[PDB]
């Protein structure tokens, strides 16, 4: 179960879609949240320049500072994904 | 509750301040987002921006931090990730 639901975004629509597609691939490949996060972060550093940060989990709160137009927070199934650029 | 430092690239005094700050946050708030916000805001004020904080019982992370500005620790079963980047 990997249905995507965007909770909050400051990001272009096409980059949002790419984030979802990237996370979907990550979850196909990796079982562990850290490794899912790592895949997504590394792909975003490569495609959209450093420095990205990714949190993947079922129970967490955050408070972060992001660069304009580079923040997304979404669910794939029951797993929440926070992805943002800072640095 | 019981503080257990799992990872740290951070001075001894700053580690202790992170723990102290989180302990105060957990006294004041129940909501993870609000605990995180308190810790982030205090660290930005005391040690300059830009910090980021995650508080939760179930998550994995992959982040990039500035040298000497990363800590990952538990208070009880709640994990706290606190780092600078930017």
């Amino acid at each position: 179960d990997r249905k995507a639901v965007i909770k909050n975004a400051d990001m272009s629509e096409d980059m949002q879609q790419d984030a979802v597609d990237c996370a979907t691939q990550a979850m196909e490949k990796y079982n562990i949240e850290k490794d899912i996060a790592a895949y997504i972060k590394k792909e975003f550093d490569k495609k959209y320049n450093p420095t990205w940060h990714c949190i993947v989990g079922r129970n967490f709160g955050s408070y972060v500072t992001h660069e304009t137009k580079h923040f997304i927070y979404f669910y794939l199934g029951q797993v929440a994904i926070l992805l943002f650029k800072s640095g | 509750r019981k503080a257990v430092i799992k990872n740290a690239d951070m001075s001894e005094d700053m580690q202790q301040d992170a723990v102290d700050c989180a302990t105060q946050a957990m006294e004041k708030y129940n909501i993870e987002k609000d605990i995180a916000a308190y810790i982030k805001k205090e660290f930005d004020k005391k040690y300059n921006p830009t910090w980021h904080c995650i508080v939760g019982r179930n998550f994995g992370s992959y982040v990039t931090h500035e040298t000497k500005h990363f800590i990952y620790f538990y208070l009880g079963q709640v994990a706290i990730l606190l780092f600078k980047s930017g």
């Binding site: 909770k7 129970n59 967490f60 709160g61 972060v64 929440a80 | 993870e32 987002k33």
Partner: peptide, 7 residues
């Protein structure tokens, strides 16, 4: 600056 909270 902004925050998130899981359901």
């Amino acid at each position: 600056s902004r925050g998130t909270q899981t359901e």
